Design a protein around this ligand. Structure first.
Ligand SMILES: Cc1cc2nc3c(=O)[nH]c(=O)nc-3n(C[C@H](O)[C@H](O)[C@H](O)COP(=O)(O)O)c2cc1C
Lengths: 914, 42, 160, 85
């Protein structure tokens, strides 16, 4: 057979009379197909041979249909016969969603009864968890049910028809608030009959429809796998829901054989109908002043709603703001915590006017700002608050008086959930609904109307697989809870929508639940404690090493000495520190030409044992360093020197620079210490560009060091760890104020994040820059070492106030280029700080005048306090360079450039100047 | 505007959160400068 | 050029430390307390402390429970006795072929095949094996035993 | 924009103005006016709702003298572009 359209065709082996009948159906089918669009980028034009086959079988679906079904399944669904979604997304990734959903629909139209247990990798290995979304997940929620009805007709048409009759029967029960009805079938089948999104979003309407979406997704997950609800629910470890989905969760827990499942769906739908109608009757939303919504809109804000979502702020801060607004509002238009989606994700219920005033206060207090040049302790807080698409203040006192009415109305219809099989986690208290003295429906109604939602506490799961059946999908509850459980080993599957999988492959999808091959069907999110656990290992000689992602590459301990221009330019410190068996990167900052760098590298190579390897550190701020050092490193590598690593200092290079550094010069790994969230993003992009080349980060918080890109050591690596570990070749090591096992072990084992309430976040290694100064191998002067030791330290919380005074004998000073340097508060360093606070900060004209007026004072200060004295001084007396005889100039040059005790000049170039 | 300015900074120092919560859009106007707003002549 | 003074203090004016600027970390200064001790000693103390924490926590304080390998290193972060591999030209991945020849155990031949670099008198040059064992078309390879020996044959002048 | 109601029964019931020309087809046909036109008082109240909404800020203190004249005529399910300045 030649079923074809454009440059695609499919071959079917048909019996003779069957071939005549198939030819009849084929000319009839091409009578309906459209012409090629020169790319198959149209609407009804198939873009794949199997898309054409699906169109053909769907046409017949309005003996040959079985043949086409079997041929299609054998040709394209290789063991994924029930998993047409997997094929659809295979087309999306390799071969848009409209045609993918169309092939899915045509296949499901064609199939016979699907009562066959699908091998979904043992349905994801038998902990299965079912979460249900709530209200406000998405604005255009109704199109979700539109596509659901259109494309899964054979599976949930019966359910939708049942819901339509149930709701049209429920309206006579009490009353109709529904100015445009609630007949869902008419709206779905006739697009013109459907009212506007505002009326659809009105709660008495929307709550039944959101229940419809959840129950439809559950019914699809049952029928596709051929699993009755009574046994699918058994497969689930437990189930719960958001602000609205908890009723669906308890109903699914009460599921049974299909006949009883329809009764369960009736119960859930009637309960949500009563909840929505009673809530709207108790608090009907009113007109909203147009000047007020205009003011809200012209400040980057959405339409005001009875719920306001605030992100990037803690419950305590958000609560303090509500207390201000409530103190200045009457009790009856107060704002209360409606739901706590996470530590930095909240939603607050109340009147839209009260929440608008709330948002005015929050906009006044917030900032737009490029605060990278501002210390972290004094940085203004950022947040992105917006109103959810909802028309009711759920979980607030406004609907509290609707509660008793809801229960009284429920008691008349026999609505009662008693026989729950799986646990249903309480959305507020977190416990199981099974162990409740009061009726389950009473508790759930009180939850949805009055009580808040501590979402994380409710979903304190101990499970591996979670699936969201609610509205929103990508914008729904699954993605929201995935952020809360990124690193705890939880895999969220969005079992309510088919789409191309995330480009970073973070949460699953309908295709992922329905896959049958146990490589994409079974997908586990990273559990950092387990997969980055600091392990131990032993060598043949018996030496014990700490096996991590960092120690594994180096073959030695995961405790490096970072590059240091003053401290790690000596040949001996590098050579002996390496001979101790610890990686150290010789800094180039003390070397100003390739000949000096080559001499130092040669000396270190000669002084280290065979089989050894060192690293080099280069500063990216100065292009001269790069242009003389990168060719030298390439030359030494082509020679075959033991240079193992290149650590690029402050300033992550561009993608092209990282590319040439990774390919041209053959290093084992590339140290790429960033100093900001953006710089970490650049490093991640470089690692993506080179997925196989190891890249050790060496991220430094700027709390300790020399030149510190001032940040916090915790927050950036708290919010970027998740994005850092989605990279097989990024190795995560961090320093910035580490000097002992006591303060490094929590970071190695990941326990450091417990205080922040994040999953354990193990670190591959740690770098020690300031702890190794006092080491005997370092050539820093003994008086300098005594000063380093005698200067006390500063706990982490108090580091950032070093800009103002000597925190533990260390202060921040401005560079010639403006970068801040942490320096011990010596007399010279304090003079430096005084000058860069009082003189160098002034404009040029004011700089010179102030320079003279305070030069009268600076000459003395340079003489008594700084490295560089005033050259004009003679025996004590302050003189200018003009008040100087040639003899005393020469004498001063001897005194200041030639060392008497060592009987040598400081430097040959100084001798040449003399 | 000797009184308009001090009324402005009074509401700023004392009634900022009050105005926010109650959704009060205070418009301080002076005959010297904001005459167009006084006479509704935008 | 203010950084060298802390290293060479015998030259600055009167060898006074307070006149020199020394870079250091406020959070690490509390841990930095001891004068003139070996850098190897410092790093050994840190490593041994970490090993003590790990042995107490994840191994019940028994060193015999630590997994043992002949050599520790050479593993990229982004990654019977008688076997015969007939190499072809269709698609034998270099990495997969070298891994198969290297084997599973962290033994001498595993190191000597999977390692990407060779040392020549303290000189890291390219591994000659990644050139010799490179996929050709007829480089049939054979290991006699898990730790006995390895042999690679080729159809030279029409004779294997 | 304000939209006249699909039927005039609810306004007739609530206001007490049971004039058949608004609800009964036969009486409108007899009166020769074009169909069951909507209540002019419905139109006035619906556009004064626009005034109270936009000109005020949902503030009931601003409700004061509201003159209105039914110059034309409005059918049910009629979309009307109100303008005020
Ligand atoms: C004296 C000194 C010099 C440093 N020089 C450099 C440098 O030249 N290039 C660079 O990227 N980092 C440099 N650093 C930063 C270190 O590599 C490391 O990040 C820092 O010392 C960690 O501080 P901590 O051990 O107190 O936590 C220097 C640090 C110090 C203390």
């Amino acid at each position: 057979f030649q079923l074809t359209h454009g440059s695609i065709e499919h071959t079917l082996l048909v019996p003779n009379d069957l071939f005549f009948n198939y030819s009849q159906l084929k000319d009839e089918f091409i009578k309906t197909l459209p012409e090629p669009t020169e790319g198959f980028a149209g609407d009804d034009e198939p873009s794949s041979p199997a898309e054409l086959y699906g169109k053909f079988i769907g046409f017949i679906s309005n003996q040959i249909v079985e043949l086409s079904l079997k041929d299609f399944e054998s040709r394209f669904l290789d063991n994924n016969n029930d998993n047409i979604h997997s094929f659809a997304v295979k087309l999306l990734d390799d071969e848009i969603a409209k045609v993918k959903e169309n092939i899915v629909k045509n296949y499901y139209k064609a199939v016979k009864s699907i009562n066959k247990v699908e091998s979904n990798l043992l349905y994801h290995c038998k902990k299965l968890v079912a979460i249900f979304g709530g209200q406000g997940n998405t604005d255009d929620y109704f199109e979700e049910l539109r596509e659901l009805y259109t494309l899964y007709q054979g599976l949930i048409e019966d359910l939708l028809v049942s819901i339509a009759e149930k709701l049209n029967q429920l309206h006579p029960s009490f009353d109709k608030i529904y100015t445009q009805g609630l007949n869902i079938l008419s709206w779905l089948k006739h697009p013109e009959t459907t009212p506007d999104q505002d009326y659809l979003l009105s709660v008495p309407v929307s709550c039944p429809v959101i229940c419809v979406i959840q129950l439809c997704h559950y019914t699809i997950t049952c029928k596709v796998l051929g699993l009755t609800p009574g046994e699918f629910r058994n497969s689930l470890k437990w189930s719960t829901g958001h602000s609205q989905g908890l009723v669906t969760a308890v109903t699914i827990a009460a599921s049974d054989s299909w006949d009883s499942f329809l009764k369960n769906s009736l119960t859930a739908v009637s309960l949500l109908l009563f909840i929505g109608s009673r809530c709207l009757s108790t608090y009907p939303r009113t007109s909203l002043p147009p000047t007020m919504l205009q003011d809200s809109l012209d400040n980057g804000e959405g339409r005001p709603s009875p719920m306001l979502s605030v992100r990037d702020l803690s419950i305590k801060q958000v609560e303090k703001f509500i207390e201000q607004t409530n103190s200045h509002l009457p009790r009856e238009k107060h704002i209360a915590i409606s739901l706590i989606n996470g530590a930095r994700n909240l939603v607050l219920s109340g009147p839209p006017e009260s929440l608008y005033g709330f948002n005015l206060n929050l906009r006044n207090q917030k900032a737009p700002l490029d605060q990278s040049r501002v210390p972290f302790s004094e940085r203004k807080l950022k947040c992105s608050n917006r109103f959810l698409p909802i028309f009711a203040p759920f979980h607030s006192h406004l609907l509290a008086d609707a509660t008793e009415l809801i229960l009284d109305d429920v008691k008349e219809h026999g609505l009662s959930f008693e026989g729950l099989k799986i646990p249903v986690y309480d959305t507020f208290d977190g416990s199981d609904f099974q162990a409740l003295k009061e009726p389950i429906i009473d508790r759930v109604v009180k939850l949805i109307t009055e009580l808040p939602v501590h979402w994380e506490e409710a979903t304190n799961h101990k499970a591996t697989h979670i699936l969201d059946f609610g509205p929103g999908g990508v914008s729904g509850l699954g993605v929201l809870t995935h952020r809360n459980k990124e690193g705890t080993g939880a895999r969220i599957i969005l079992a309510g929508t088919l789409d191309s999988n995330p480009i970073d492959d973070e949460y699953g999808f309908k295709h992922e639940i329905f896959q049958t091959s146990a490589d994409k069907a079974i997908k586990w999110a990273p559990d950092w404690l387990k997969e980055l656990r600091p392990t131990l290992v032993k060598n043949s000689e018996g030496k014990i090493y700490v096996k991590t992602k960092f120690s594994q590459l180096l073959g030695r301990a995961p405790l490096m000495v970072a590059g240091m221009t003053p401290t790690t330019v000596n040949t001996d410190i590098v050579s002996a520190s390496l001979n101790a068996g610890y990686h150290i990167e010789l800094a180039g900052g003390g070397y100003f030409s390739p000949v000096m760098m080559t001499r130092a590298i040669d000396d270190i190579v000669s002084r280290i044992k065979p089989g050894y390897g060192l690293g080099i550190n280069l500063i990216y701020v100065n292009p001269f360093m790069l242009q003389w050092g990168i060719p030298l490193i390439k030359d030494l590598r082509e020679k075959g020197y033991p240079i193992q690593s290149l650590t690029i200092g402050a300033g992550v290079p561009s993608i092209e620079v990282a590319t040439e550094y990774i390919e041209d010069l053959g290093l084992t790994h590339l140290g790429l210490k960033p100093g900001s969230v953006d710089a970490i993003s650049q490093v991640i992009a470089i690692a993506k560009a080179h997925p196989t080349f190891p890249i050790v980060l060496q991220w430094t918080g700027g709390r300790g060091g020399g030149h510190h890109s001032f940040e916090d050591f915790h927050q950036p690596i708290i919010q970027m760890y998740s994005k850092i570990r989605r990279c097989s070749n990024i190795v995560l090591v961090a320093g910035s104020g580490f000097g002992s096992d006591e303060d490094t072990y929590p970071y190695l084992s990941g326990y450091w994040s417990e205080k922040f309430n994040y999953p354990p976040m193990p670190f591959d290694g740690v770098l020690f820059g300031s702890r190794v100064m006092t080491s005997k191998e370092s050539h820093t002067s003994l008086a300098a070492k005594k000063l380093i030791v005698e200067c006390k330290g500063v706990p982490d919380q108090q580091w950032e106030q070093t800009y103002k005074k000597p925190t533990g004998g260390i202060i921040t000073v401005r560079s010639e280029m403006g970068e801040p340097i942490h320096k011990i508060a010596t007399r010279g360093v304090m003079f430096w700080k005084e000058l860069d606070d009082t003189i160098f900060n002034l404009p040029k004209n004011k700089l010179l005048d102030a320079l003279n007026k305070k030069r009268d004072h600076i000459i003395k200060k340079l003489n008594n306090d700084f490295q560089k004295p005033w050259f004009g001084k003679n025996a004590n007396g302050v003189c200018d360079l003009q008040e100087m005889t040639y003899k005393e100039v020469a004498n001063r040059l001897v005194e200041l450039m030639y060392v008497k005790k060592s009987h040598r000049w400081i430097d040959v170039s100084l001798r040449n100047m003399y | 505007p000797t009184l308009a300015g001090m009324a402005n900074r009074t509401i700023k120092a004392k009634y900022e959160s009050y105005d926010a919560a109650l959704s009060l859009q205070r418009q301080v106007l002076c005959y010297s400068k904001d005459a167009k707003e006084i006479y509704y002549k935008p | 050029d203010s950084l060298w003074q802390s290293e060479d203090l015998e030259s600055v004016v009167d060898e006074d430390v307070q006149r020199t600027c020394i870079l250091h970390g406020p959070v690490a200064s509390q841990y930095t307390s001891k004068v003139d001790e070996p850098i190897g000693d410092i790093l050994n103390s840190i490593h041994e402390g970490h090993i003590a924490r790990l042995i107490k926590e994840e191994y019940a304080g028994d060193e015999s429970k630590i997994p043992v390998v002949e050599y520790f290193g050479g593993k990229k972060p982004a990654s019977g006795n008688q076997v015969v591999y007939e190499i072809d030209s269709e698609l034998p991945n270099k990495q997969e072929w070298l891994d198969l020849l290297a084997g599973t155990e962290l033994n001498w031949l595993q190191a000597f095949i999977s390692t990407d670099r060779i040392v020549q008198g303290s000189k890291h040059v390219s591994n000659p094996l990644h050139d010799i064992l490179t996929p050709a078309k007829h480089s049939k390879v054979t290991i006699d035993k898990k730790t006995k020996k390895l042999t690679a044959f080729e159809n030279i002048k029409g004779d294997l | 924009t304000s939209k006249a109601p699909g039927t005039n029964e609810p306004y007739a019931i609530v206001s007490g103005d049971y004039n058949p020309i608004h609800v009964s087809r036969v009486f409108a046909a007899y009166a020769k006016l074009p169909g069951t036109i909507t209540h002019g008082m419905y139109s006035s109240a619906s556009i004064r709702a626009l005034v109270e909404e936009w000109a005020a800020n949902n503030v009931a203190a601003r409700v004061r003298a509201f003159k209105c004249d039914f110059v034309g005529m409005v059918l049910p399910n009629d979309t009307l572009q109100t303008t005020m300045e």
